Amino acid sequence: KLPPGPFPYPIVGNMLQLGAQPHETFAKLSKKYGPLMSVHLGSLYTVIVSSPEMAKEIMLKYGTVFSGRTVAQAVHACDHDKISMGFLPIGAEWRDMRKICKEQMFSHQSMEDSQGLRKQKLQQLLDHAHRCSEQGRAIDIREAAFITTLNLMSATLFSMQATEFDSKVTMEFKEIIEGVASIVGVPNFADYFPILRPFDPQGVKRRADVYFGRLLALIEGYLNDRIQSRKANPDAPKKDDFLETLVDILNSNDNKLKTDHLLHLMLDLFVGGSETSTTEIEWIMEELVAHPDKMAKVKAELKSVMGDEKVVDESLMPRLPYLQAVVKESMRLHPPGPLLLPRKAESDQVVNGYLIPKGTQVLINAWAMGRDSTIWNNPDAFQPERFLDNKIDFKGQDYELIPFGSGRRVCPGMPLANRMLHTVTATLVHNFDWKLERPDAPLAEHQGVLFGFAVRRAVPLRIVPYK
């Protein structure tokens, strides 16, 4: 009674038929089997959903049913799978971490207060960007967008006041994320073949506990050191960051959260906003460089609003209606997560007549719906003009665009993502002219796909500022 899919082979099921870079294969197989597919990844049953109306059935109509999360083995490291807001069933401790996220830390009231903590972090990059232009060196966009992202998240969370782009604090964080991504970003057969779960054959759960213990040790030091600063100054001026808010929650003791609940929350906030922004800023700074007709419309717009100001204030978003679309088009073409984050059917539920069993990992292919010929016309072409004078937005209600998810577990970092994805892009676009470090380059590198935590270019984007 389940959705249609290819013949499950013994044991392996449909885990050899995927080929390399599965996101496209889960898309092409949908043209024969349908929007609701059934792929037997080993023992892990999985339903692929690749159409807006079906994503509406999954995330909204039956959303409270499909509101779980498939948990990976690396997530059990340091008991993260039982503390994190990302991978907990919708419950008492999760509702608190949402109402805390959306209403206090990610509402506009806190975004506008954290506006000044992040401009300094763009200036450090813009000054470093000018460093590579004088001697005429090339800038690794991924490297530059990662360190800037950590400096951006660390300022929003901790209010670190370093004077160096590659500060000592930031590079301790950079290794651990890249170490975690190198762990989760590769397949762990314990997830698909449960008899291997006790053994942990590839040693994934262990190696994750090492880096998780480090990333949580550095977060602890930033908590206990603030408590003493909170004790020394009783009328301490409210820091306009996320950590100060979190300290002000367990001192009032209104909600029902522990201390480890907050530590692991800052981890998810830190990790969740780093490698996503890092990849999803490499794309626009490639799309605009690969299609110079469109960068020209962005620059001429930016010069119309900036004036002589050389850093983009996140409050000038409404006056950049084209950069809003340029990101929107990058959301459609190259979504950061090709299959988003796995959902789980917490109850036997029927969708479109087919039965979806309990514990069915529902992957919402956002890559296909970005290149589905039935939705966007000429989908394989970059064109931010299709979003001009269009209310289609990635807020979750336009299932034609689901890069940030929708339903009950929508991305809580959306207001912080777009203010980042726009400013750190509009600061490199408005200030310099870019050209590929290698114009005689294989197009396999351009729009290349790397399956892992997020899909990114096959080769890190390396361009030069020559103005």
124 part of the interface to ligand HEM, by CB under 6 A: no
CB of 443: closest distance to ligand HEM in angstroms?
Answer: 25
Contact status: 42 vs ligand HEM (CB under 6 A)? no
Q: What is d(CA 210, CA 214) in angstroms, rounded to the nearest whole number? A: 6
Minimum CB separation from ligand HEM for residue 411, in Å? 4
| Distance between CA atoms of residues 156 and 122, nearest Å | 13
Q: For ligand HEM, which is the closer residue by CB, 44 or 306? A: 44
Select from 28-36, 291-299, 397-405, 444-452 the region that touches ligand HEM (CB under 6 A): 397-405
- Report residue 38: phi and psi, to 5°: -135, 110
**Among 10-18, 216-224, 268-276, 354-362, the segment contacting ligand HEM (CB under 6 A):** 268-276
338 is a contact residue toward ligand HEM (CB under 6 A)? no
- Amino acid 327 reads V
**In the set 45, 404, 432, 434, which binds ligand HEM (CB under 6 A)?**
404
The helix (run of H) or strand (run of E) holding residue 41 is strand 36-41
Smallest gap, in angstroms, from Cβ of residue 269 to ligand HEM?
Answer: 4
Q: What is the separation of C-alpha 217 from the centre of its chain, rounded to a whole number of angstroms?
A: 23
Is residue 340 a contact point for ligand HEM (CB under 6 A)? yes
Helix (H) or strand (E) segment spanning residue 270: helix 260-282
Residue 242 near residue 107 (C-beta atoms within 8 A): no
Nearer Cβ to ligand HEM, position 98 or 297? 98
Distance of CA 372 to CAs 17, 137, 367, 392, Å?
21, 39, 8, 16
Residue 272 binds ligand HEM (CB under 6 A): yes
What is the b/e burial string over 94-132, where b = at least 16 CB atoms within 10 angstroms of the residue's CB?
A: bebbbebbeeebbeeebbeebbebbbebbebbbebbeeb
Residue 86 contacts by C-beta under 8 Å, 6 or more apart in sequence? 69, 268, 272, 341
Q: Does 412 bind ligand HEM (CB under 6 A)?
A: yes
Residue type, 117: L
How would you classify the pairing of strands 361-364 and 343-344?
A: antiparallel
Instruction: Give the interface segment with ligand HEM, choosing from 17-25, 31-39, 247-255, 403-411 (CB under 6 A).
Output: 403-411
Those residues whose C-beta lies under 8 Å from the C-beta of residue 374, and which sit 6 or more positions away, are none
Stretch that binds ligand HEM, among 13-21, 44-52, 274-282, 455-463 (CB under 6 A): 274-282
Taking CB under 6 A as the rule, does residue 243 contact ligand HEM? no
Asked if 277 touches ligand HEM (CB under 6 A), the answer is: yes
Question: Could you say which of 138, 196, 223, 341 contacts ligand HEM (CB under 6 A)?
Answer: 341
Residues in binding contact with ligand HEM, number by CB under 6 A: 26
CA–CA distance, 97 with 103 (Å, rounded to integer): 10
Show the DSSP H helices in 334-453 as ranges. Answer: 414-431
Binder of ligand HEM out of 152, 401, 411, 461 (CB under 6 A): 411
Does 148 interact with ligand HEM (rule: CB under 6 A)? Answer: no
Q: How far is it, in rounded angstroms, from Cα 94 to Cα 77?
A: 19
To the question of whether residue 78 is assigned a binding role by annotation, the answer is no
CB 102 to ligand HEM: min, Å: 10
* 80-119 binders of ligand HEM (CB under 6 A): 85-86
Residue 337 as a binder of ligand HEM (CB under 6 A): the answer is yes
417 touching ligand HEM, by CB under 6 A: yes
Q: What are the structure tokens assigned to 280, written together? A: 């999803």
Which one of 148, 361, 406, 423 is in contact with ligand HEM (CB under 6 A)? 406
**Is 35 a residue that touches ligand HEM (CB under 6 A)?**
no
Angle between helices 260-282 and 204-232 (to 10 degrees): 110
Assign 425 to helix, strand or coil.
Answer: helix
Beta-bridge partners for 350: 355
Q: What is the DSSP letter of 338?
A: T
Using an 8 Å Cβ cutoff, are 363 and 44 in contact? no
Nearer to ligand HEM, 133 or 360 (CB): 360
Q: Is there binding between residue 52 and ligand HEM (CB under 6 A)? A: no
Residues of the binding site: 411
Q: Binding residues for ligand HEM, per CB under 6 A?
A: 85-86, 268-269, 272-273, 276-277, 280, 336-337, 340-341, 343, 403-407, 409-413, 416-417
Residues of the binding site for heme: 411
